Structures are given as C-alpha cells and as structure tokens.
Design a protein around this ligand. Structure first.
Ligand code: ATP
Lengths: 350, 689, 49, 49
C-alpha cells in the first residue's frame, strides 16, 4: 500500500535531517549541497519529492551523514514573521470622525480607491502611488491611521517598525529585507506599513559592526529591493516618520516615494468632535463649556485632548464626584500643559 | 459627615426615631449614604421588626438593592406599593428599579406562569416615559400582549425613535436572536402604530413578514390617500410574494377605487418605466456582442455565448441577427436559443407575439417548445399564451407537446401563481399521471406547481403534492426524480411559519436516503431562519453523515438561514474535506454586494481541479458582481488556457453582465453534474429585473 | 518621547520648604543621641532648601 | 540512592530552540548557535504539545 512505500521513503530519511542551501542544479539527480558552512559532497536526491519545484540555489531538506537531498523547504520564520505578518485586522477604523478629515480623504482616494477599485486606471492610464510618507508632529494620528487602514483593510496588512532590521551579524539586515519583501510578495496584494525610519539616519548602535558601513548596506538593500526592480505591480508600501532631516534624498526622489503628506495640529471645528467623543463616555456636568478648552490651547495634539478629558475626571473622581466642574477643567488643562511661556523670563510678547 | 451621631439610630426599636430617621435617610438617599452602605450588617437584625413600616421597606429595598439580591430585593417594593427628573429619581427609579424591576420581571417571568408585576411594570413603563430614554428600557421590557400595550402606551409623540430605533434593533434582534412567536407581537402592533403613522413602506416591510391581505388593502386606501406612485407600484411588486397579487387583484378587482391599482399591482406597470428608460439612460456597446461573442465556436460555447448575448438586456439586436445561429444548434440548446428571445424580452407583450410567432409551430419540436417557453418568459399578465400550448399538452408518453409541457407549464408557473390556482393543476394531474422518462416533465411539474405553491398559508399537505409523494414513491428510478420532486415539495412547504409538515412527511416518506434525502429537503425548505440554534447544532451533527448528498442540501440551508447576521456565514467549510462541502459554501456566498472576504474565499475557491467544483465557482463568483470584474475572468482564462472549462468561462461571462422569486431557480440549479438536457433547464433562472 | 500621550504625569521636584525641611529634620534628627533644649526651626530656617 | 548516580553519566539533553513544527510528526529545530534541523519527535511528547 501507499503507507508502506511512504514508510520506505520515510526510511530513506535518516531522522537527523538538516537544512541546507543549494548552489546549482547538477542535472543528473546527484547534486552538491551547501550548508551554512558549506560541506558539499556529490549527494543525490530522494526521487519522490519533486526536484522541479525549486529554482537553483534554494534551500532543501538534507541529511547529516550522507548529506543527500531529502525533501523540500517550507518557509523562513523569524521573530519578525510573527510581527510583519499582521494576524488580525486589529481594531479602530475610527472611533471619532473629526480627527483630521482632510488627509483622511487623501489616504482614502490615494491608497484605498486605487487598491479597492483598480479600474479607473484603465480609463486614464495612471500608475498607482507606490510610496507615501506620513509625517509631522508626534502623536498626531499617524500610527492611529496605520491601525485605521490596518483595520479598514482589503489586503494582507503588514506592520513593520523601522528599527526591526538592526543586527550585529553580517548581511543579516539585507537577509531580512529579502524575507521582508518575500512576505510582501507571496500572500496577496498587501499593505506594507513601515514606521520610524527617521531614526535610522544619525544612529549608531551596540549590537553592531562598523556603524557607517553596516546600515548603509541594509538601507541600500532597501533601496534596491523596495522600489528598484522586482515589478511592484500591486504592492502597497506606506512609510511614516516625524522628522525629515536624516532622510537620504535617494529614496525621497520620485519613482520611489510619490506622495509626502504632512499633518497639522487640528482646528477648532475638528477639535469639538475629539473633545466631545473623548467625553462621550463620561458623566459630565454639561453646564461647563468645552469652547474655552477648544479655543485656549492653540497647538494641542489629540493626546492633549485625551489627557485633559481624562484628567478632569481624575479631578472630579479625585473627590468621588461623578460630574465635572469647570475648575477641574482648569486644573486639568493646567495640569496637562506645563511651562506656559507667557511672562516671567522675557515674555517680550506683551 | 461622621457617623457618630447617625449610626446608633438603628439600635433603638422605637417607632418615632425610625419615623424621623427614615425621612432623614431619605434626605441623605440622594447620594445613598456617605459610602457603600456599611450599615448593612447591623440592620438586617431589624428585618424582624414591623406604623411607618413601608418606609422601612423603602429602607430595606434601598440597602438590599444597594448591595446584592435577586429575589429579596424587589420583595419590599412589591410590599410597599410605591409611595411617598431628579438625581434621587435617577437613583431609586432609573437604575435601582431598572435592574431591580428587571430582575423582578425576569425572575417572575421565568418563575411563575401575577398582576403586581403588571402594575409595577407599567409604572416603570410610565417612569421611563418620564425619563424618556429608549433603546435600553425597551429591550428590558421586551421580556416582560404586554409589549403591545407597551407600544400603544408609549407611541404618542416620538415616532422615529421607537420606529427606527426600536423597530430596527428589535426587528434585527428579533430575527437574529428572539424566537418566532413574540415576533408576531412585533408584526401586529407595529401594524398598529404605523397605522397611526406616515411613511407607508415600513408597513409594507411588515407585509414582507406578515403575508396578510388586510394590510395591502389598508396600504392601498392609505397609499391612495397619500398620492412616487408607480415607484411604490414597483417595490410593491418586488416586495410581494406570489399569492397576494392574485388575492390583491381579486379584492381590488371588486372595488378598485380608481382602477389604476389594478393596472399597477399585478404586472404590466412595474416594467413600463424601466425598459424605455433602460434604453434611455444607459448605453451598452456592440463590443460585447462581438468581443465577448468572439469566444470560439465548438457549438457549445456558441450556444452559451448566444445565451450571454441573450443577457445583454442599444436594442433587441440579438433577436434579429439573421439565421444559422440556431441552425448550428442542438436540441436542448434549441430550447436554450428558442427561449433566448424571451430572455431579451421581459417586456413587449404585443411584440413578444410578433417575434416568437416566426418560431411558433415551426418545423422543429425544440423551436416550438422553447418558443412557448419564451412565451412563458416574456410576461406574467397576459394569459393568452396559455391556449396554444395548454390544449396540446396531452401526449400520454413521449410526444412533442410534453416538451412544450417542459416549456409552458413552468412558463405559466412563471406567468401566474394564485392563492391556489387549480385548472393548471388539473392539467398537472395527467402530467404527473404521464410520468415521462424525460426528467423535466416531473421537474417542471414540481417546480411549476411549487411556484404556484410557494408563499402558501403555512403550506399544505394537499393531495397535489401528496399525490406526487405517493406517485413519487411509485417508481424508484432516475434519482433526479428523487431529487427534483422534493424541490417542488419543499416549494409547497414555503409560506410556513410553524410547519409540522416536516413531521408529516417524516411519517409518510422516510426510507432509504432517496426519501430520507426528501426528508432533508423538507428539513431545508421549511426552516427558513430565525434564532433557532438547536437545529443549527443539529446542522453540526448530521453534517458528519456518511451519505454525502444530504450533506449538500442540508448544509446548503446556511445562506437561507443566516442571510442577515452574515458575520457567522464565513465558516470552515472550505477547511473541510468532503469536496461538495466546498461547493456548499461556494453556494453560500450568493449574489449580493460581494464583500472582500467573499472574493478572498474566491481566491482559493477559484483554484480547484475538478470541473464540477471549478464549474461551481464562476457562477456565484460572477453572480455576486453583476480590472475588477474581468480580472477574475481573465484569471479563469489563465486557469484553463476541458469544454467544461470553456462552459464555466461562458458562465462567468454570463453572470458578469426574502423575495421568493430569486430563491428557487438556483436551488433548482443544484444538480448540474449531468446532461445538457439539465442545461436546457439552465436557461430558466430568472431572478434579475 | 516628550509628548504627554507618551508620559502622562510630569512632576518637578522643588526644594522642600522649611516645613518639610523641618519635618525631615525631625526624621533624621530622631535617631540621634539628643540634647534637650534645641530649636530645629532655626536650622531649617538656615537651610536654603 | 547512591547507585542512581550512573544516570549522571548521560551528559544531559541540551536545550533545543524550536521555531514551530510542521506535519509528518516532525519539527523545525534551530540549534542554539547553529542552523535549522528537521528531526523526528519522541513519543512521550506530542505534536500538539
Ligand atoms: N479625532 C482626532 N482628531 C485629531 N487628532 C486626533 C484624534 N484622535 C487622536 N488624535 C491624535 O492622534 C494621535 C494618535 O496616536 P499616534 O499614533 O499619533 O501617537 P504616537 O504613537 O505617539 O504617534 P507617533 O509615534 O507618530 O508620534 C494622538 O496622539 C492624538 O493626539
């Protein structure tokens, strides 16, 4: 039966089996096999697995003793495959409209609509945007928008931190670039997101060789693999920073990165929805006016709205009061915002 | 403050200290206490003490309601008979008597089965009419008709909150989670308050579930009182089932009040704005007549390509494309092409006669039988294409008019469906009495009388379908009969609310899995869907049955059951191995808006090797999207480039470019792995406008 | 890092006052061999903080 | 109890670093500072373990 011949192939397999990289097809079914250290006898292949699945120079299943080619490889999994491949569409498409409302449309019709409906480009002959940078003040919504398009997705979403690629072994970074874009290739049209790559410029590290000539090579592999060859087709890639100065302009140049999208701090019309929805789930003495908080602070982030709208509940619930007086918003905003440069030292502005 | 003055007040059992302490504790009952009621352990000794003892009940339910109790908490308030927009009223009425009265209504609703819970329940109804917060208190007082007098108790001023909010969440949760019988207390008292209200089609959505004849007369005297007009004619005809436009055309044939509701609500006036404006506002190009029509000739994909060109409907151009397209065609493809003209012509009543008349009474049996089939396709309000076929029908074994019985009996089933229309069925008694070895005689018998017989008054086990049960069990040959007869049997089970017809056929029919497969067919068609998990987990169990065809329909029941709470509809049916199960989910996608996880399942389901399952993917694939659309088309072009592959290719090219009328014919299409005679019945699946 | 949504509470430490310098003066003056007749408010007064 | 100490002479089964298993009752072991090695499992432990 097939269990007997299958067990015979299993007995061709000697239980310590190794994993080694091919170099070249030697066409007459005896091959020559590199290990990680490359001890390469003229070994043969177990001739029931398909030899013609693999290109030359691809990893296989081997033996220790005779080193004979036994089986086919499956994948490569690192601590990054767990993190690069996002498992679920996590959460938070939006809990509050009124965050930005401007570049929401821009990321929507720039990223979502060419992806979700790629038939407009037939009508007009337009290429899709390949690289878009999302950058500005810290904690604007950029990471939150990455989790938005992560949740409101249509693709195999990929989440990458830019500092994941930093190793001490030689070539290890570009190897994880190759596994990286292999992941970016072989699922479906996937949304790659890469964040905090403004912290790859003036950066020197401990677990490292010669610093100026290590990550130059890895980022060089990013420049070659990212938007050089290997036909983009439909592979969405979105990166994000906070600053711009350490950016090598060789990737900033078009072809590679197409759209550079800033982020302002929100205006008072959009503030009211963030103030309101951050207060949508709390007991509040509604006689107080949020418009003092909406008017007063001029360059708030939404974390300032968050911190005040939690902090006033820390001041009312500090004394077991379910609803919040206006002076708890006073101590709230004066507790959040510190070192208000108004008078004292110079205050030349008066 | 400090409890040193006020904590020793519980220690004397003197009456005046209690009867001025309890108003003082009522004064400090605005915050409950200073704390989380540390008085509890010293005042449960005072349980045994009895002048102003209902105030002591207010104290007792206040502290027992303050910590925890499921039955002893509302026990003082049912002894108190509540006596003596506030924060205190937000305490002791809103939340304390919300959860307290809610566990009294739940605990007595599950315990006994009095009127004290009716009086306190209407007191909480009135009290939440004071507090005026819906979408909570409502779903609490659903459990506690009672809900009927709640709806006429509450619907005075706020219309859209109770209608949109309460009818949305309670209709959706009532088809989702709540079982059937309280739903009619939905369907009738929502009939009542919307009787007081405008925006009539919500009542017509009540007509989607009631199937009642009084509401359509009330909505026609009312929808004539509110004079768009032909628009509610259109979704009147799309919303109605097969029974109530014949009952509607007789109860409106008597009075009619303008005689325009007779012209609208049978036929002939839903399509008259459509088809000229279909020509007007839209413009289709000749490059799909030719370009999708340039798919090469094998006299099979020329047949199916002429069928795709039959579904182009900038005019009826394929009707008059000369000759020798049907001359190269074979028999059931001559059924396909002789009925192809009517599929271009789901309008043009007088023009249908002068286009089919060339192919009427012709030299070929399939030209005339498919021609009368097209006469069944074109319209539903003529009854003048009855007599050229209806008199011919009687053949007694295997003559021409039997094949016209293939075309017209189903076509008259396409044309008319009464309450129980019977002259066609008295014609059907020698049709099933014929019992031709051609399958589609009894096929369109069961399916056509089922099209008359869907939407019935909880079905019927009348001698029509009982006759085809016994005469079904007469001969056990050609098991498509054992498959396509419980088709129309289950169609006559439709219109059910409470059908024990599954038990009746479970007594009469059951045997070896031809008729146990009839048992699983009635198990499908009589159990349309509610919050009914007990047969869903039974769905889990008999999924593991050794007979692999009752799995097909029995698990195919999914998209009928859970069509609304569609998040559960992705399951592991692809992850199973009983290869027709992948076909079952491949049915269970459907024809709707076509979300991203659907096509994500069509990535893997697109790629499979058996031409039955690979033939089963492009139908629902391109059916759910009626490049983006042509990207899976050229993907199938990459899949193949047998003739089954080119036929599924023409199937996707076809489909690319709870109403009962769209529910039958794909469930009729569930036995595809067979002759082109069955593919002659492939050209019947009319479900689109 | 200095976004407040990253570090919520941000507390400066000033020099403690003569009340607090007096209290700590009680704390670490407590365990000594002590001579009666001492004013600690003078010494905490002499502290700049 | 003292005669047990021949069990000490079996040098200890060193720690293995498994990424994950695959089918056919075999795993993927990446030895400490070495490469990947698909090997077969024992019986007192499971594929589900
Ligand atoms: N509705 C809204 N309108 C405007 N801004 C918002 C809204 N909701 C959140 N935000 C802001 O957007 C940010 C969302 O989190 P974000 O990912 O930007 O934090 P972060 O991880 O610090 O970002 P980065 O790492 O890029 O600095 C919050 O800091 C908040 O201030």
């Amino acid at each position: 039966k097939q269990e007997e011949e299958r067990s015979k192939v299993d007995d061709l397999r000697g239980t310590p089996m190794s994993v080694g990289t091919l170099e070249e097809i030697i066409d007459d079914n005896h091959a020559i096999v590199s290990t990680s250290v490359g001890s390469e006898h003229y070994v043969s292949i177990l001739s029931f697995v398909d030899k013609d699945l693999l290109e030359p120079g691809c990893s296989v299943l081997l033996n220790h003793k005779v080193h004979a080619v036994i089986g086919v490889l499956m994948d490569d999994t690192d601590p990054l495959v767990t993190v690069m491949k996002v498992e679920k569409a996590p959460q938070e498409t939006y809990a509050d409209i009124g965050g930005l409302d401007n570049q929401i449309q821009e990321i929507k019709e720039s990223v979502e609509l060419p992806l979700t409906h790629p038939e407009y480009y037939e009508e007009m002959g337009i290429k899709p945007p390949k690289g878009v940078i999302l950058y500005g003040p810290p904690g604007t919504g950029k990471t939150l928008l990455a989790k938005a398009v992560a949740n409101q997705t249509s693709a195999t979403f990929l989440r990458v931190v830019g500092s994941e690629l930093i190793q001490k072994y030689l070539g290890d970074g570009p190897k994880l670039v190759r596994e990286l874009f292999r992941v970016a290739e072989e699922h479906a049209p996937s949304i790659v997101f890469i964040d905090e790559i403004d912290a790859i410029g003036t950066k020197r590290y401990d677990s490292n060789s010669g610093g100026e000539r290590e990550i130059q090579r890895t980022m060089l592999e990013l420049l070659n693999q990212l938007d050089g060859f290997d036909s983009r087709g439909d592979v969405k890639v979105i990166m994000a920073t906070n600053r711009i100065e350490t950016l090598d302009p060789a990737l900033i140049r078009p072809g590679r990165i197409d759209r550079k999208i800033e982020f302002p701090l929100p205006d008072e019309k959009t503030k009211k929805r963030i103030f309101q929805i951050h207060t949508s789930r709390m007991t509040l003495a509604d006689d107080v006016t949020l418009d003092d908080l909406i008017m007063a602070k001029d360059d708030l982030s939404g974390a300032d709205i968050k911190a005040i709208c939690t902090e006033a509940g820390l001041m009312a619930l500090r004394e077991r009061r379910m609803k919040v007086t206006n002076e708890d918003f006073k101590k709230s905003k004066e507790n959040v915002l510190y070192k208000k440069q108004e008078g004292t030292p110079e205050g030349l502005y008066l | 403050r400090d409890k040193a003055p006020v904590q020793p007040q519980q220690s004397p059992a003197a009456a005046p200290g209690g009867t001025d302490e309890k108003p003082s504790g009522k004064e400090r009952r605005d915050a409950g206490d200073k704390d989380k009621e540390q008085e509890l352990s010293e005042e449960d000794k005072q349980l045994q003490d009895e002048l102003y003892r209902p105030a002591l009940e207010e104290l007792r339910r206040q502290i027992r309601s303050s910590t925890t109790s499921m039955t002893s908490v509302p026990k003082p308030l049912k002894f108190l008979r509540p006596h003596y927009n506030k924060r205190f009223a937000a305490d002791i009425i809103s939340v304390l008597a919300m959860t307290m009265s809610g566990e009294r209504e739940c605990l007595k609703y599950r315990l006994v089965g009095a009127g004290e819970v009716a009086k306190e329940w209407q007191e909480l109804d009135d009290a939440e009419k004071v507090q005026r917060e819906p979408l909570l208190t409502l779903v609490k007082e659903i459990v506690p008709l009672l809900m009927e007098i709640e709806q006429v108790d509450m619907l005075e001023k706020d219309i859209d909150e109770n209608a949109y909010a309460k009818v949305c969440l309670y209709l959706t949760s009532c088809v989702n989670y709540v079982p059937e019988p309280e739903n009619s207390a939905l369907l009738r008292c929502a009939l009542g308050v919307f009787r007081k209200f405008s925006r009539f089609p919500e009542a017509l959505r009540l007509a989607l579930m009631l199937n009642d004849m009084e509401l359509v007369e009330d909505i026609f005297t009312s929808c004539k009182d509110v004079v768009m007009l032909g628009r509610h004619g259109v979704f009147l005809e799309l919303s109605e089932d097969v029974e109530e436009y014949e009952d509607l055309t007789e109860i409106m044939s008597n009075v009619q009040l303008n005689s325009n509701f007779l012209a609208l609500a049978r036929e002939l006036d839903i399509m008259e704005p459509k088809v000229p404006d279909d020509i007007y506002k839209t413009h289709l190009e000749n490059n799909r007549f030719g370009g999708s029509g340039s798919q090469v000739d094998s006299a099979r994909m020329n047949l199916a390509s002429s069928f795709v060109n039959g579904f182009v409907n900038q005019d009826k151009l394929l009707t008059d494309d000369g000759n020798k397209w049907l001359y190269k065609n074979k028999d059931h493809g001559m059924l396909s092409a002789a009925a192809s003209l009517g599929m271009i012509l789901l309008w043009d009543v007088d023009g249908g006669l002068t286009q089919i008349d060339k192919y009427l009474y012709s030299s070929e049996d399939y030209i005339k039988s498919g021609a009368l089939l097209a006469c069944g396709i074109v319209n539903s309000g003529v009854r003048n294409e009855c007599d050229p076929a209806l008199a011919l029908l009687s053949d007694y074994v295997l003559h021409n008019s039997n094949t016209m019985r293939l075309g017209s009996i189903f076509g008259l089933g396409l044309a008319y469906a009464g309450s129980n229309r019977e002259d066609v069925l008295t014609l059907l008694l020698p049709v099933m009495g014929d019992s031709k070895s051609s399958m589609e005689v009894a096929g369109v018998t069961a399916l056509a009388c089922g099209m008359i017989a869907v939407g019935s008054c909880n079905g019927d086990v009348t001698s029509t379908i009982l006759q085809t049960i016994m005469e079904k069990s007469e001969t056990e040959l050609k098991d498509t009969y054992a498959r396509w007869l419980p088709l129309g049997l289950g169609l006559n089970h439709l219109g059910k609310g409470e059908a024990i017809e599954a038990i009746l056929a479970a007594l009469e029919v059951v045997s070896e899995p031809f008729r146990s497969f009839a048992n699983t067919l009635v198990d499908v068609c009589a159990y349309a869907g509610s919050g009914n998990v007990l047969k869903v987990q039974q769905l889990l169990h008999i999924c593991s049955e050794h007979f692999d065809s009752k799995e097909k329909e029995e698990d195919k029941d999914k998209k009928e059951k859970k069509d609304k709470d569609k998040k559960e509809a992705p399951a592991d049916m692809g992850a199973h191995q009983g290869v027709a199960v992948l076909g079952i989910a491949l049915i269970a996608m459907g024809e709707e808006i076509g979300a991203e996880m659907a096509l994500r399942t069509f990535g893997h389901l697109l790629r499979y090797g058996e031409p039955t399952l690979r033939r089963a993917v492009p139908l629902a694939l391109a059916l759910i999207s009626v490049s983006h659309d042509a990207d899976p088309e050229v993907s199938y072009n990459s899949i193949f480039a047998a003739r089954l592959a080119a036929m599924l290719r023409q199937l996707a090219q076809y489909h690319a470019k709870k109403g009962t009328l769209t529910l039958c014919p794909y469930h009729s299409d569930r036995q595809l792995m067979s002759q082109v005679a069955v593919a002659g019945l492939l050209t019947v699946l009319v479900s689109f406008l | 890092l200095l976004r407040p949504g990253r570090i919520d509470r941000k507390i400066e430490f000033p020099p403690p006052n003569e009340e607090a310098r007096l209290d700590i003066l009680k704390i670490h003056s407590r365990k000594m061999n002590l001579t009666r007749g001492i004013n600690l408010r003078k010494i905490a007064e002499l502290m700049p903080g | 109890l003292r005669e047990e100490l021949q069990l000490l002479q079996e040098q200890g089964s060193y720690v293995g670093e498994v990424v994950r298993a695959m089918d056919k009752k075999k795993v993927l072991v990446k030895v400490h500072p070495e490469g990947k090695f698909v090997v077969d499992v024992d019986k007192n432990i499971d594929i589900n373990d």
